């Protein structure tokens, strides 16, 4: 461990334009391994990682039929929510859910979660105690009371502590060590003009995975906590990620600045500077 089994669910209505679009996307350790997309003639849960092909026809059938059951329950929820919120029947709305379990190296549940959003805003969430609900607004109180009465939290705890955990284990026997995949960043500094006697030094990190990384600039040993410009980390499109951080520095003082790159994949952080060609 640790390991995680996560599902991201989306349900989007489109009145007059077809049935709601429904999607279940599953991740083992933040890597997509299954997906159900309702937007098809004969929609089926499909393996999204080749290791998942190990699972037999009985798995996909069961998962597919469960997905279609979920889909139709969400069809209903979408109508329920129009009522709760006094909304027109003509507009598009979305329900999202995040459901899953994070499991420690000892195989025990670290954290289980089950949270909903309607039109991009918190709706209701199972609390960390796996026993109570947080309702975000007046409509969510209705759901909350209904779920408290039916003992929905207890059903969820049982799934989170058991089923979720047991499935994650089974998936891992088929595709683990894969999730441990690590690609270290390669870095370089580029040099760019500014008006007057200033220049820009841009420290790039490329080809890394996972996306978590930190870039810093130091003047003579102290991180420049101010005026450092950066971009949000971004996918290269090949499974790896990019980032850069830049600082404006006085012309002629380029060698006084140092870029540091911290990433789980590296033996130790990278340290580099503007290296002007001969």
């Amino acid at each position: 461990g640790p390991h995680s089994l996560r599902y991201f669910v989306t349900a989007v209505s489109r009145p007059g334009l077809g049935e709601p679009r429904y999607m279940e996307v599953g991740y083992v350790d933040d890597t997509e391994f299954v997906r159900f997309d309702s937007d098809a003639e004969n929609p089926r849960y499909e393996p999204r990682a080749r290791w998942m092909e190990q699972e037999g026809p009985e798995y996909w059938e069961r998962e597919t039929q469960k997905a279609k059951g979920n889909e139709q329950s969400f069809r209903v929820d979408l109508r329920t929510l129009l009522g709760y919120y006094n909304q027109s029947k003509g507009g598009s709305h979305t329900i999202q859910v995040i459901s899953g379990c994070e499991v420690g190296s000892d195989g025990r549940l670290l954290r289980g979660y089950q949270q909903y959003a309607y039109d991009g805003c918190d709706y209701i969430a199972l609390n960390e105690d796996l026993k109570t609900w947080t309702a975000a607004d007046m409509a969510a109180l209705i759901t909350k009371h209904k779920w408290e009465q039916a003992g929905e939290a207890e059903r969820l705890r049982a799934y989170l502590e058991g089923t979720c955990v047991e499935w994650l284990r089974r998936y891992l026997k088929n595709g683990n060590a894969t999730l441990l995949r690590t690609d270290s960043p390669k870095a370089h500094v580029t040099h760019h003009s500014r008006p007057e006697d200033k220049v820009t030094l841009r420290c790039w990190a490329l080809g890394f995975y996972p996306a978590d990384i930190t870039l810093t600039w130091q003047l003579n040993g102290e991180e420049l906590i101010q005026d450092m410009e950066l971009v949000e980390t971004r996918p290269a499109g090949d499974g790896t990620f990019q980032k850069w951080a830049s600082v404006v520095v006085p012309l002629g003082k380029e060698q006084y600045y140092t870029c540091h790159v911290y990433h789980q994949g590296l033996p130790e952080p990278l340290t580099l500077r503007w290296e002007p060609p001969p």
Binding site: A67, T80, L81, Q114, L156
Partner: peptide
Amino acid sequence: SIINFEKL
């Protein structure tokens, strides 16, 4: 395996 969701 994802849970079977209950109605809102």
